[PDB]
mmCIF file of C-alpha atoms and ligand atoms in Angstrom:
data_model
loop_
_atom_site.group_PDB
_atom_site.id
_atom_site.type_symbol
_atom_site.label_atom_id
_atom_site.label_comp_id
_atom_site.label_asym_id
_atom_site.label_seq_id
_atom_site.Cartn_x
_atom_site.Cartn_y
_atom_site.Cartn_z
ATOM 1 C CA UNK T 194 -46.129 49.237 22.587
ATOM 2 C CA UNK T 195 -45.307 47.856 25.537
ATOM 3 C CA UNK T 196 -47.036 49.736 27.236
ATOM 4 C CA UNK T 197 -50.661 47.526 26.820
ATOM 5 C CA UNK T 198 -48.759 44.676 27.471
ATOM 6 C CA UNK T 199 -48.006 45.404 31.218
ATOM 7 C CA UNK T 200 -49.254 43.640 34.764
ATOM 8 C CA UNK T 201 -49.219 43.381 37.948
ATOM 9 C CA UNK T 202 -49.436 39.529 37.978
ATOM 10 C CA UNK T 203 -52.655 38.928 35.931
ATOM 11 C CA UNK T 204 -53.603 41.906 36.731
ATOM 12 C CA UNK T 205 -53.575 45.947 34.789
ATOM 13 C CA UNK T 206 -49.889 47.106 36.615
ATOM 14 C CA UNK T 207 -50.457 50.916 37.456
ATOM 15 C CA UNK T 208 -48.559 52.878 34.118
ATOM 16 C CA UNK T 209 -51.821 50.363 31.592
ATOM 17 C CA UNK T 210 -53.881 51.277 33.773
ATOM 18 C CA UNK T 211 -52.387 55.968 34.041
ATOM 19 C CA UNK T 212 -53.000 55.259 30.712
ATOM 20 C CA UNK T 213 -56.452 53.526 30.365
ATOM 21 C CA UNK T 214 -57.575 56.814 32.973
ATOM 22 C CA UNK T 215 -56.589 58.870 29.706
ATOM 23 C CA UNK T 216 -60.387 57.126 28.234
ATOM 24 C CA UNK T 217 -61.133 54.338 26.322
ATOM 25 C CA UNK T 218 -59.698 56.051 22.871
ATOM 26 C CA UNK T 219 -56.200 57.081 22.857
ATOM 27 C CA UNK T 220 -54.113 58.491 19.719
ATOM 28 C CA UNK T 221 -50.615 58.216 19.621
ATOM 29 C CA UNK T 222 -48.550 60.055 17.545
ATOM 30 C CA UNK T 223 -45.354 58.501 16.803
ATOM 31 C CA UNK T 224 -41.948 60.982 18.027
ATOM 32 C CA UNK T 225 -40.115 60.726 14.935
ATOM 33 C CA UNK T 226 -43.759 61.034 12.523
ATOM 34 C CA UNK T 227 -43.299 58.098 11.224
ATOM 35 C CA UNK T 228 -47.104 57.551 11.849
ATOM 36 C CA UNK T 229 -49.959 58.083 13.983
ATOM 37 C CA UNK T 230 -51.487 55.556 15.800
ATOM 38 C CA UNK T 231 -54.217 54.796 18.751
ATOM 39 C CA UNK T 232 -55.082 52.869 21.235
ATOM 40 C CA UNK T 233 -58.506 50.891 21.727
ATOM 41 C CA UNK T 234 -58.591 50.716 25.525
ATOM 42 C CA UNK T 235 -63.005 50.377 26.269
ATOM 43 C CA UNK T 236 -65.399 47.358 25.438
ATOM 44 C CA UNK T 237 -66.987 49.494 23.635
ATOM 45 C CA UNK T 238 -64.830 50.997 21.635
ATOM 46 C CA UNK T 239 -63.350 47.747 20.233
ATOM 47 C CA UNK T 240 -66.081 46.696 19.236
ATOM 48 C CA UNK T 241 -66.604 49.635 17.371
ATOM 49 C CA UNK T 242 -63.082 49.575 15.851
ATOM 50 C CA UNK T 243 -63.165 45.306 15.476
ATOM 51 C CA UNK T 244 -67.311 45.698 13.514
ATOM 52 C CA UNK T 245 -65.834 48.844 10.852
ATOM 53 C CA UNK T 246 -65.678 47.765 7.237
ATOM 54 C CA UNK T 247 -63.095 51.080 7.313
ATOM 55 C CA UNK T 248 -60.622 49.258 8.972
ATOM 56 C CA UNK T 249 -57.779 45.986 7.173
ATOM 57 C CA UNK T 250 -55.470 43.963 8.103
ATOM 58 C CA UNK T 251 -52.625 45.504 6.359
ATOM 59 C CA UNK T 252 -48.780 44.945 7.049
ATOM 60 C CA UNK T 253 -47.531 48.951 8.844
ATOM 61 C CA UNK T 254 -43.687 49.255 9.379
ATOM 62 C CA UNK T 255 -44.392 51.310 12.388
ATOM 63 C CA UNK T 256 -44.738 35.456 8.188
ATOM 64 C CA UNK T 257 -47.163 35.161 6.031
ATOM 65 C CA UNK T 258 -48.991 31.995 5.591
ATOM 66 C CA UNK T 259 -51.413 30.171 3.562
ATOM 67 C CA UNK T 260 -55.087 28.893 5.268
ATOM 68 C CA UNK T 261 -54.116 31.089 7.964
ATOM 69 C CA UNK T 262 -57.522 33.799 8.154
ATOM 70 C CA UNK T 263 -55.834 35.551 10.819
ATOM 71 C CA UNK T 264 -53.921 37.431 7.414
ATOM 72 C CA UNK T 265 -57.031 37.851 4.979
ATOM 73 C CA UNK T 266 -59.540 40.523 4.357
ATOM 74 C CA UNK T 267 -62.151 40.446 2.049
ATOM 75 C CA UNK T 268 -63.174 38.680 0.221
ATOM 76 C CA UNK T 269 -60.439 36.037 0.246
ATOM 77 C CA UNK T 270 -60.852 36.016 4.246
ATOM 78 C CA UNK T 271 -64.734 35.222 3.492
ATOM 79 C CA UNK T 272 -64.950 32.377 1.276
ATOM 80 C CA UNK T 273 -61.972 30.086 3.006
ATOM 81 C CA UNK T 274 -64.211 31.510 6.154
ATOM 82 C CA UNK T 275 -66.863 29.453 5.465
ATOM 83 C CA UNK T 276 -65.639 26.670 3.737
ATOM 84 C CA UNK T 277 -64.079 25.835 7.462
ATOM 85 C CA UNK T 278 -66.905 27.380 9.379
ATOM 86 C CA UNK T 279 -69.172 23.886 9.728
ATOM 87 C CA UNK T 280 -66.116 22.363 11.742
ATOM 88 C CA UNK T 281 -67.491 24.549 14.591
ATOM 89 C CA UNK T 282 -70.972 23.935 14.343
ATOM 90 C CA UNK T 283 -73.139 23.076 17.661
ATOM 91 C CA UNK T 284 -73.585 20.161 15.528
ATOM 92 C CA UNK T 285 -69.735 18.915 15.618
ATOM 93 C CA UNK T 286 -69.124 20.548 19.062
ATOM 94 C CA UNK T 287 -72.029 18.173 21.290
ATOM 95 C CA UNK T 288 -70.706 14.583 18.508
ATOM 96 C CA UNK T 289 -66.942 15.981 19.718
ATOM 97 C CA UNK T 290 -67.865 16.961 23.470
ATOM 98 C CA UNK T 291 -66.671 12.954 24.924
ATOM 99 C CA UNK T 292 -63.877 12.644 23.183
ATOM 100 C CA UNK T 293 -62.696 15.601 24.972
ATOM 101 C CA UNK T 294 -63.785 14.835 28.062
ATOM 102 C CA UNK T 295 -62.325 11.617 27.184
ATOM 103 C CA UNK T 296 -58.870 13.508 26.144
ATOM 104 C CA UNK T 297 -58.931 15.663 29.695
ATOM 105 C CA UNK T 298 -59.669 12.359 31.359
ATOM 106 C CA UNK T 299 -56.323 10.603 30.472
ATOM 107 C CA UNK T 300 -53.933 13.457 30.697
ATOM 108 C CA UNK T 301 -56.219 13.713 34.275
ATOM 109 C CA UNK T 302 -55.193 10.166 34.976
ATOM 110 C CA UNK T 303 -51.391 10.747 33.808
ATOM 111 C CA UNK T 304 -51.471 13.468 36.601
ATOM 112 C CA UNK T 305 -52.786 11.277 40.250
ATOM 113 C CA UNK T 306 -50.676 8.537 38.445
ATOM 114 C CA UNK T 307 -47.265 10.475 38.191
ATOM 115 C CA UNK T 308 -48.716 11.559 41.357
ATOM 116 C CA UNK T 309 -47.916 15.303 43.465
ATOM 117 C CA UNK T 310 -46.224 17.601 42.736
ATOM 118 C CA UNK T 311 -46.423 18.455 38.558
ATOM 119 C CA UNK T 312 -45.774 20.472 37.043
ATOM 120 C CA UNK T 313 -49.895 21.167 35.432
ATOM 121 C CA UNK T 314 -48.432 23.670 32.000
ATOM 122 C CA UNK T 315 -45.594 20.865 30.273
ATOM 123 C CA UNK T 316 -46.787 17.589 32.362
ATOM 124 C CA UNK T 317 -50.867 18.454 31.834
ATOM 125 C CA UNK T 318 -52.527 21.626 30.232
ATOM 126 C CA UNK T 319 -49.939 21.442 26.317
ATOM 127 C CA UNK T 320 -50.725 17.829 26.641
ATOM 128 C CA UNK T 321 -53.796 17.922 27.321
ATOM 129 C CA UNK T 322 -55.284 21.227 24.691
ATOM 130 C CA UNK T 323 -52.415 19.003 22.061
ATOM 131 C CA UNK T 324 -54.310 16.349 22.561
ATOM 132 C CA UNK T 325 -57.541 17.806 22.125
ATOM 133 C CA UNK T 326 -56.456 19.708 18.541
ATOM 134 C CA UNK T 327 -55.295 16.456 16.812
ATOM 135 C CA UNK T 328 -59.017 14.428 17.746
ATOM 136 C CA UNK T 329 -60.836 17.496 16.368
ATOM 137 C CA UNK T 330 -58.112 18.241 13.128
ATOM 138 C CA UNK T 331 -58.666 14.422 12.538
ATOM 139 C CA UNK T 332 -54.870 14.340 12.531
ATOM 140 C CA UNK T 333 -54.655 10.318 11.866
ATOM 141 C CA UNK T 334 -53.669 8.274 15.364
ATOM 142 C CA UNK T 335 -50.511 7.517 13.593
ATOM 143 C CA UNK T 336 -49.201 10.858 12.745
ATOM 144 C CA UNK T 337 -50.154 12.504 16.798
ATOM 145 C CA UNK T 338 -46.905 11.833 18.483
ATOM 146 C CA UNK T 339 -44.834 13.273 16.231
ATOM 147 C CA UNK T 340 -46.998 16.255 15.046
ATOM 148 C CA UNK T 341 -47.094 17.051 18.864
ATOM 149 C CA UNK T 342 -43.146 17.205 19.113
ATOM 150 C CA UNK T 343 -42.478 18.909 15.649
ATOM 151 C CA UNK T 344 -44.915 21.462 16.900
ATOM 152 C CA UNK T 345 -42.985 21.499 20.210
ATOM 153 C CA UNK T 346 -43.504 20.545 4.473
ATOM 154 C CA UNK T 347 -44.712 17.775 7.234
ATOM 155 C CA UNK T 348 -47.793 19.478 7.344
ATOM 156 C CA UNK T 349 -48.133 19.853 3.739
ATOM 157 C CA UNK T 350 -47.260 15.946 3.451
ATOM 158 C CA UNK T 351 -49.651 15.320 6.179
ATOM 159 C CA UNK T 352 -52.156 16.941 4.928
ATOM 160 C CA UNK T 353 -51.282 15.711 1.062
ATOM 161 C CA UNK T 354 -52.210 12.941 2.487
ATOM 162 C CA UNK T 355 -55.039 12.667 4.576
ATOM 163 C CA UNK T 356 -56.085 14.829 1.778
ATOM 164 C CA UNK T 357 -56.128 12.461 -0.793
ATOM 165 C CA UNK T 358 -57.162 10.296 1.743
ATOM 166 C CA UNK T 359 -60.082 11.362 3.334
ATOM 167 C CA UNK T 360 -60.209 10.968 7.564
ATOM 168 C CA UNK T 361 -62.491 12.418 10.268
ATOM 169 C CA UNK T 362 -62.053 16.016 11.465
ATOM 170 C CA UNK T 363 -61.940 19.314 10.593
ATOM 171 C CA UNK T 364 -59.406 18.622 7.817
ATOM 172 C CA UNK T 365 -61.222 15.656 6.376
ATOM 173 C CA UNK T 366 -63.711 17.722 6.319
ATOM 174 C CA UNK T 367 -62.332 20.613 4.229
ATOM 175 C CA UNK T 368 -60.646 18.637 2.063
ATOM 176 C CA UNK T 369 -63.295 16.231 1.442
ATOM 177 C CA UNK T 370 -66.001 19.039 0.942
ATOM 178 C CA UNK T 371 -63.717 21.105 -0.579
ATOM 179 C CA UNK T 372 -60.784 19.405 -2.075
ATOM 180 C CA UNK T 373 -60.086 21.463 -5.083
ATOM 181 C CA UNK T 374 -60.566 24.741 -3.980
ATOM 182 C CA UNK T 375 -58.337 24.272 -0.967
ATOM 183 C CA UNK T 376 -54.426 23.190 -2.346
ATOM 184 C CA UNK T 377 -51.977 21.124 0.803
ATOM 185 C CA UNK T 378 -49.904 24.280 1.447
ATOM 186 C CA UNK T 379 -53.614 25.916 2.597
ATOM 187 C CA UNK T 380 -55.131 22.551 4.484
ATOM 188 C CA UNK T 381 -51.423 22.510 6.185
ATOM 189 C CA UNK T 382 -51.535 26.389 7.124
ATOM 190 C CA UNK T 383 -55.325 25.447 8.875
ATOM 191 C CA UNK T 384 -53.695 23.405 10.577
ATOM 192 C CA UNK T 385 -50.919 24.886 12.035
ATOM 193 C CA UNK T 386 -52.547 27.682 12.832
ATOM 194 C CA UNK T 387 -55.027 25.223 15.313
ATOM 195 C CA UNK T 388 -51.618 23.198 16.933
ATOM 196 C CA UNK T 389 -49.193 26.001 17.451
ATOM 197 C CA UNK T 390 -51.094 29.123 18.628
ATOM 198 C CA UNK T 391 -53.992 28.248 18.971
ATOM 199 C CA UNK T 392 -52.704 25.348 21.717
ATOM 200 C CA UNK T 393 -50.846 28.290 22.780
ATOM 201 C CA UNK T 394 -53.696 30.344 23.956
ATOM 202 C CA UNK T 395 -55.837 27.823 25.543
ATOM 203 C CA UNK T 396 -52.570 26.009 27.665
ATOM 204 C CA UNK T 397 -52.674 28.662 29.113
ATOM 205 C CA UNK T 398 -56.209 29.935 30.029
ATOM 206 C CA UNK T 399 -56.011 26.548 31.313
ATOM 207 C CA UNK T 400 -52.812 26.912 33.424
ATOM 208 C CA UNK T 401 -53.304 30.748 34.791
ATOM 209 C CA UNK T 402 -57.110 29.297 34.560
ATOM 210 C CA UNK T 403 -56.124 27.099 36.990
ATOM 211 C CA UNK T 404 -53.720 28.807 39.271
ATOM 212 C CA UNK T 405 -56.986 31.468 39.226
ATOM 213 C CA UNK T 406 -59.211 28.966 40.606
ATOM 214 C CA UNK T 407 -56.682 27.798 43.176
ATOM 215 C CA UNK T 408 -56.205 31.720 44.444
ATOM 216 C CA UNK T 409 -60.018 32.233 45.028
ATOM 217 C CA UNK T 410 -60.673 28.997 46.539
ATOM 218 C CA UNK T 411 -64.304 29.195 47.728
ATOM 219 C CA UNK T 412 -65.146 29.047 43.644
ATOM 220 C CA UNK T 413 -62.303 25.922 43.357
ATOM 221 C CA UNK T 414 -65.371 24.499 45.917
ATOM 222 C CA UNK T 415 -68.276 25.960 44.346
ATOM 223 C CA UNK T 416 -67.458 25.269 40.302
ATOM 224 C CA UNK T 417 -67.430 21.617 41.895
ATOM 225 C CA UNK T 418 -69.788 21.435 43.987
ATOM 226 C CA UNK T 419 -71.853 23.214 41.056
ATOM 227 C CA UNK T 420 -71.313 21.816 38.223
ATOM 228 C CA UNK T 421 -73.461 23.379 36.132
ATOM 229 C CA UNK T 422 -71.553 26.805 36.643
ATOM 230 C CA UNK T 423 -68.728 25.335 34.256
ATOM 231 C CA UNK T 424 -69.876 28.163 31.182
ATOM 232 C CA UNK T 425 -70.189 31.031 33.052
ATOM 233 C CA UNK T 426 -66.958 30.425 34.817
ATOM 234 C CA UNK T 427 -65.425 29.998 31.759
ATOM 235 C CA UNK T 428 -66.162 33.206 30.203
ATOM 236 C CA UNK T 429 -65.281 34.670 33.816
ATOM 237 C CA UNK T 430 -61.662 33.273 33.092
ATOM 238 C CA UNK T 431 -61.367 33.980 30.231
ATOM 239 C CA UNK T 432 -61.847 37.725 30.432
ATOM 240 C CA UNK T 433 -60.082 37.735 34.436
ATOM 241 C CA UNK T 434 -57.169 36.331 32.167
ATOM 242 C CA UNK T 435 -57.734 37.817 28.758
ATOM 243 C CA UNK T 436 -54.036 35.140 27.366
ATOM 244 C CA UNK T 437 -54.022 37.192 23.752
ATOM 245 C CA UNK T 438 -53.422 40.739 25.175
ATOM 246 C CA UNK T 439 -53.940 43.104 22.185
ATOM 247 C CA UNK T 440 -54.645 42.660 18.517
ATOM 248 C CA UNK T 441 -52.815 43.395 15.359
ATOM 249 C CA UNK T 442 -53.491 46.833 14.065
ATOM 250 C CA UNK T 443 -57.306 47.748 12.476
ATOM 251 C CA UNK T 444 -55.362 50.700 9.334
ATOM 252 C CA UNK T 445 -58.577 53.114 8.767
ATOM 253 C CA UNK T 446 -59.272 52.938 4.935
ATOM 254 C CA UNK T 447 -61.418 56.171 5.286
ATOM 255 C CA UNK T 448 -61.702 58.937 7.654
ATOM 256 C CA UNK T 449 -63.710 56.479 10.175
ATOM 257 C CA UNK T 450 -65.364 57.937 13.265
ATOM 258 C CA UNK T 451 -64.673 56.298 16.185
ATOM 259 C CA UNK T 452 -65.711 57.031 20.551
ATOM 260 C CA UNK T 453 -66.464 60.079 18.872
ATOM 261 C CA UNK T 454 -63.306 60.642 17.070
ATOM 262 C CA UNK T 455 -62.147 61.029 13.707
ATOM 263 C CA UNK T 456 -59.580 58.323 12.680
ATOM 264 C CA UNK T 457 -57.588 59.404 9.643
ATOM 265 C CA UNK T 458 -57.253 57.402 6.975
ATOM 266 C CA UNK T 459 -54.422 54.914 6.429
ATOM 267 C CA UNK T 460 -53.350 55.724 10.625
ATOM 268 C CA UNK T 461 -53.731 52.104 12.960
ATOM 269 C CA UNK T 462 -55.368 51.239 15.518
ATOM 270 C CA UNK T 463 -54.614 48.823 17.818
ATOM 271 C CA UNK T 464 -57.588 47.165 20.455
ATOM 272 C CA UNK T 465 -56.256 45.659 23.216
ATOM 273 C CA UNK T 466 -58.724 43.251 24.544
ATOM 274 C CA UNK T 467 -56.223 43.391 28.201
ATOM 275 C CA UNK T 468 -57.632 46.415 28.812
ATOM 276 C CA UNK T 469 -60.812 46.201 27.407
ATOM 277 C CA UNK T 470 -61.481 43.679 29.920
ATOM 278 C CA UNK T 471 -59.877 45.142 32.865
ATOM 279 C CA UNK T 472 -59.842 48.036 32.817
ATOM 280 C CA UNK T 473 -63.420 49.205 33.837
ATOM 281 C CA UNK T 474 -62.525 48.568 38.358
ATOM 282 C CA UNK T 475 -67.081 48.565 38.189
ATOM 283 C CA UNK T 476 -67.037 44.782 37.666
ATOM 284 C CA UNK T 477 -63.774 43.568 37.867
ATOM 285 C CA UNK T 478 -62.892 41.182 40.775
ATOM 286 C CA UNK T 479 -62.935 37.041 39.712
ATOM 287 C CA UNK T 480 -66.397 35.986 40.547
ATOM 288 C CA UNK T 481 -67.669 33.233 38.258
ATOM 289 C CA UNK T 482 -71.152 33.461 39.681
ATOM 290 C CA UNK T 483 -71.007 36.115 37.791
ATOM 291 C CA UNK T 484 -74.276 34.735 35.228
ATOM 292 C CA UNK T 485 -72.984 37.442 31.942
ATOM 293 C CA UNK T 486 -69.339 38.464 31.401
ATOM 294 C CA UNK T 487 -68.686 41.280 29.412
ATOM 295 C CA UNK T 488 -65.676 41.149 27.388
ATOM 296 C CA UNK T 489 -63.643 40.721 23.558
ATOM 297 C CA UNK T 490 -61.975 37.320 25.132
ATOM 298 C CA UNK T 491 -61.742 36.323 21.283
ATOM 299 C CA UNK T 492 -62.711 39.080 19.210
ATOM 300 C CA UNK T 493 -65.215 40.762 17.353
ATOM 301 C CA UNK T 494 -66.778 40.819 14.576
ATOM 302 C CA UNK T 495 -66.026 38.544 11.352
ATOM 303 C CA UNK T 496 -62.383 37.344 12.507
ATOM 304 C CA UNK T 497 -63.817 36.411 15.544
ATOM 305 C CA UNK T 498 -62.240 33.318 17.199
ATOM 306 C CA UNK T 499 -63.271 31.030 14.485
ATOM 307 C CA UNK T 500 -62.163 28.606 17.441
ATOM 308 C CA UNK T 501 -63.967 29.779 20.058
ATOM 309 C CA UNK T 502 -66.734 27.063 20.243
ATOM 310 C CA UNK T 503 -64.331 25.133 20.202
ATOM 311 C CA UNK T 504 -62.248 26.581 22.747
ATOM 312 C CA UNK T 505 -65.119 27.145 25.718
ATOM 313 C CA UNK T 506 -66.392 23.334 25.011
ATOM 314 C CA UNK T 507 -62.361 22.488 25.922
ATOM 315 C CA UNK T 508 -62.047 24.572 28.595
ATOM 316 C CA UNK T 509 -65.925 23.819 30.990
ATOM 317 C CA UNK T 510 -64.340 20.388 30.467
ATOM 318 C CA UNK T 511 -60.641 20.729 31.977
ATOM 319 C CA UNK T 512 -61.697 23.102 34.537
ATOM 320 C CA UNK T 513 -65.294 20.953 36.434
ATOM 321 C CA UNK T 514 -62.643 17.746 35.563
ATOM 322 C CA UNK T 515 -59.806 19.347 37.073
ATOM 323 C CA UNK T 516 -61.927 20.359 40.685
ATOM 324 C CA UNK T 517 -63.514 17.302 41.128
ATOM 325 C CA UNK T 518 -61.008 14.676 40.252
ATOM 326 C CA UNK T 519 -57.914 17.141 43.164
ATOM 327 C CA UNK T 520 -60.635 18.789 45.765
ATOM 328 C CA UNK T 521 -56.859 19.167 47.619
ATOM 329 C CA UNK T 522 -55.659 20.984 44.659
ATOM 330 C CA UNK T 523 -53.232 23.804 45.488
ATOM 331 C CA UNK T 524 -50.062 25.182 43.886
ATOM 332 C CA UNK T 525 -46.976 23.760 45.692
ATOM 333 C CA UNK T 526 -45.198 27.466 46.470
ATOM 334 C CA UNK T 527 -46.634 30.215 47.336
ATOM 335 C CA UNK T 528 -49.397 32.193 44.711
ATOM 336 C CA UNK T 529 -46.901 34.949 44.454
ATOM 337 C CA UNK T 530 -43.837 33.077 43.845
ATOM 338 C CA UNK T 531 -45.030 32.282 40.190
ATOM 339 C CA UNK T 532 -43.724 33.798 37.132
ATOM 340 C CA UNK T 533 -45.206 35.694 34.103
ATOM 341 C CA UNK T 534 -43.799 36.005 30.700
ATOM 342 C CA UNK T 535 -42.433 39.477 30.486
ATOM 343 C CA UNK T 536 -44.387 42.246 28.495
ATOM 344 C CA UNK T 537 -44.514 41.194 24.745
ATOM 345 C CA UNK T 538 -47.171 40.645 22.168
ATOM 346 C CA UNK T 539 -46.852 37.071 22.248
ATOM 347 C CA UNK T 540 -49.453 34.309 24.466
ATOM 348 C CA UNK T 541 -50.275 35.395 27.796
ATOM 349 C CA UNK T 542 -48.916 32.972 30.386
ATOM 350 C CA UNK T 543 -46.791 31.167 33.116
ATOM 351 C CA UNK T 544 -43.973 29.626 32.983
ATOM 352 C CA UNK T 545 -44.155 26.913 35.196
ATOM 353 C CA UNK T 546 -46.991 25.879 37.781
ATOM 354 C CA UNK T 547 -45.652 23.594 40.178
ATOM 355 C CA UNK T 548 -49.154 22.049 41.299
ATOM 356 C CA UNK T 549 -49.801 19.647 44.711
ATOM 357 C CA UNK T 550 -52.770 17.444 46.349
HETATM 358 C C1 HEM S 94 -58.798 30.350 25.363
HETATM 359 C C2 HEM S 94 -58.649 29.861 24.027
HETATM 360 C C3 HEM S 94 -57.987 31.424 22.630
HETATM 361 C C4 HEM S 94 -58.721 32.823 22.477
HETATM 362 C C5 HEM S 94 -58.452 33.187 23.883
HETATM 363 C C6 HEM S 94 -58.576 32.900 21.194
HETATM 364 C C7 HEM S 94 -58.589 34.463 21.064
HETATM 365 C C8 HEM S 94 -59.011 34.818 19.388
HETATM 366 C C9 HEM S 94 -59.297 35.916 18.622
HETATM 367 C C10 HEM S 94 -58.912 37.271 20.241
HETATM 368 C C11 HEM S 94 -58.948 35.612 17.155
HETATM 369 C C12 HEM S 94 -59.291 37.792 16.766
HETATM 370 C C13 HEM S 94 -57.889 37.885 16.787
HETATM 371 C C14 HEM S 94 -57.857 39.866 16.001
HETATM 372 O O1 HEM S 94 -59.217 39.504 15.224
HETATM 373 O O2 HEM S 94 -57.712 40.601 14.922
HETATM 374 C C15 HEM S 94 -58.917 35.020 17.159
HETATM 375 C C16 HEM S 94 -58.831 34.371 16.119
HETATM 376 C C17 HEM S 94 -59.047 32.980 15.742
HETATM 377 N N1 HEM S 94 -58.385 32.053 16.042
HETATM 378 FE FE1 HEM S 94 -58.627 32.247 18.185
HETATM 379 N N2 HEM S 94 -58.480 31.357 20.385
HETATM 380 C C18 HEM S 94 -58.159 31.504 21.343
HETATM 381 C C19 HEM S 94 -58.819 29.591 20.933
HETATM 382 C C20 HEM S 94 -58.146 29.385 19.709
HETATM 383 C C21 HEM S 94 -58.721 27.766 19.491
HETATM 384 C C22 HEM S 94 -58.879 26.564 19.834
HETATM 385 C C23 HEM S 94 -58.838 27.853 17.929
HETATM 386 C C24 HEM S 94 -58.954 26.630 16.584
HETATM 387 C C25 HEM S 94 -59.457 25.054 17.474
HETATM 388 C C26 HEM S 94 -58.660 28.991 17.498
HETATM 389 C C27 HEM S 94 -59.106 29.687 16.268
HETATM 390 C C28 HEM S 94 -58.589 30.907 15.815
HETATM 391 C C29 HEM S 94 -58.543 31.374 14.086
HETATM 392 C C30 HEM S 94 -58.990 30.249 13.586
HETATM 393 C C31 HEM S 94 -58.881 32.184 14.149
HETATM 394 C C32 HEM S 94 -59.777 33.090 12.828
HETATM 395 C C33 HEM S 94 -60.407 33.711 12.506
HETATM 396 C C34 HEM S 94 -59.979 34.222 11.749
HETATM 397 O O3 HEM S 94 -59.852 36.052 11.340
HETATM 398 O O4 HEM S 94 -61.390 34.263 10.451
HETATM 399 N N3 HEM S 94 -58.186 29.510 18.521
HETATM 400 N N4 HEM S 94 -58.814 34.506 18.652
#
């Protein structure tokens, strides 16, 4: 379903806009007759689907990893998520905040030292996101360089080690509070999701979000003058970018009414976060002074991003510190020359971001 990933730079491509004109829920019978698919394109309908108990995340023919919450349905999903959820409480993010600020400052220190220009994605955003993830996980300091490199069995041995001798961070918390109830492979899988796909989403928000701010220089400056706008800005940035563009299909376990339409048992629904966040032209222009941003960039319901508290805090700290420390930041090429990754279900990202100051 490539149309769900068609963009014009950061905006929707005309072909996807035309699809969205077909209403918030679009029936897609497959030409070969093999299945009936549905596209959920509107904010309300996406929330209807994602909050419903009448869908599962089955594999459909139209890698399974231990500890990967996104591939579990209740009740195992509920069991595992309950064990790990406390690593993201407000108490946990509050304690982590100054250490994340310091890691952000470390990386802007490196940026300030190497001097301009920099390829911001590879040299700043990536390392920053990976280092914050290590700190959140409580990876032993001696292992962080190697873990980040390998990320680009080891994970299990790392989990086995840091477990039998608990430490700090999410991994230490889970092992200490639920040691017997979680295997080394499951703990490794929890780590892998944080270090791999989560860093991908976060790094892409950091780099493409920086571009977006630079493309709206009045708002770049506004965030420097009014850093209390940071939480609002992050909501508007994750909405506008929609770096996680489309979700894994939800298969109806019984006939179910969605958006006034009957989705039949066994039919698969594809939720477009991109369309839901961007296809309403009323409130689409980028504006960090919006006090409340309407979006589903982190999903909704039982699979709502477990990392959203960390992501929101890390992005707020990063964007606010960046605009403060580099008031003269600009793209080192015209924005129209920036390359974006071609249509894919992979994370939406730019390919490089040359910046100067
Ligand atoms: C801007 C960054 C991020 C975005 C846009 C994002 C987006 C999402 C979305 C849309 C989902 C739900 C997928 C679905 O329902 O099919 C999700 C799930 C998840 N996210 Fe994130 N994510 C981000 C960062 C993070 C981070 C930093 C972490 C961990 C530290 C994380 C961990 C997870 C996990 C573990 C799940 C699965 C939860 C479950 O299935 O119960 N994510 N994410």
